[PDB]
Amino acid sequence: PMEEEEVETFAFQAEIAQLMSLIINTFYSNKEIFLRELISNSSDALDKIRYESLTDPSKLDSGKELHINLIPNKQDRTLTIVDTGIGMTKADLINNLGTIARSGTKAFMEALQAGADISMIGQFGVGFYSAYLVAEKVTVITKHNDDEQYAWESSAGGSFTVRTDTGEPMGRGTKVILHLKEDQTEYLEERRIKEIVKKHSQFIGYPITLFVEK
Ligand SMILES: Nc1ncnc2c1ncn2[C@@H]1O[C@H](COP(=O)(O)OP(N)(=O)O)[C@@H](O)[C@H]1O
Ligand SMILES: [Mg+2]
């Protein structure tokens, strides 16, 4: 029986779209910090579970472990960052991942224009968009306790879509799927992934596991 998925399309806020264009079309040293930004986002999302739970018991009754899995797929040329954090409602995806201005965007674009390290992106409140250093398309599957499962997707170019995501239930949390650019396949290598997690992500307070395809 055929599923129906409602799809809505949204313009990125003016400066976020400009930032994405800058990120996409400019060479940066130190691209590898994208992974640090996504793991940090997962970590924040798991912190929120813990604070809902240390503070609102029904959350306590989940049996899911709080964790981050990294899943490179060399066949599909994707890298997926999965967490069991609080997830995002539909409103959350639309508001938080592209329609609302961030006060740091302009200053961050000026800093990059003046040759700052892309690694500074975490301090300007726009760290998610580092995904576009290495990915030509990003899909975010998400499931929050208060909503249905949603998929957000953008190949940049000024808009993104949010749609209900039916079947493949993922349970609470978020999966960010990076469809890597043809020249960024080094981020599918177990040794590369381990290197960058050790160098940039060693104070995450949750277990992170890397799934290596035999
Ligand atoms: N893995 C994730 N789980 C839940 N929400 C996530 C997420 N990754 C990103 N987000 C949402 O996207 C927002 C933007 O993230 P980012 O560009 O890194 O800025 P920041 N300082 O809030 O971490 C986050 O504040 C959060 O609301
Ligand atoms: Mg962040």
Curated annotation (Swiss-Prot):
Chain positions recorded as ATP binding sites: 41, 83, 102, 128
Signal peptide: none
Superkingdom field: Eukaryota
Post-translational modification N6-acetyllysine, affected residues: 48, 74
Modification(s) after translation: ISGylated. S-nitrosylated; negatively regulates the ATPase activity and the activation of eNOS by HSP90AA1.
Region (Interaction with NR3C1): 1-214
Subcellular location field: Nucleus; Cytoplasm; Melanosome; Cell membrane
Family: Belongs to the heat shock protein 90 family.
Recorded domain comment: The TPR repeat-binding motif mediates interaction with TPR repeat-containing proteins like the co-chaperone STUB1.
Assembly and interaction partners: Homodimer. Identified in NR3C1/GCR steroid receptor-chaperone complexes formed at least by NR3C1, HSP90AA1 and a variety of proteins containing TPR repeats such as FKBP4, FKBP5, PPID, PPP5C or STIP1. Forms a complex containing HSP90AA1, TSC1 and TSC2; TSC1 is required to recruit TCS2 to the complex. The closed form interacts (via the middle domain and TPR repeat-binding motif) with co-chaperone TSC1 (via C-terminus). Interacts with TOM34. Interacts with TERT; the interaction, together with PTGES3, is required for correct assembly and stabilization of the TERT holoenzyme complex.
Function summary: Molecular chaperone that promotes the maturation, structural maintenance and proper regulation of specific target proteins involved for instance in cell cycle control and signal transduction. Undergoes a functional cycle that is linked to its ATPase activity which is essential for its chaperone activity. This cycle probably induces conformational changes in the client proteins, thereby causing their activation. Interacts dynamically with various co-chaperones that modulate its substrate recognition, ATPase cycle and chaperone function.
UniProt name for this protein: Heat shock protein HSP 90-alpha
Species per Swiss-Prot/TrEMBL record: Homo sapiens
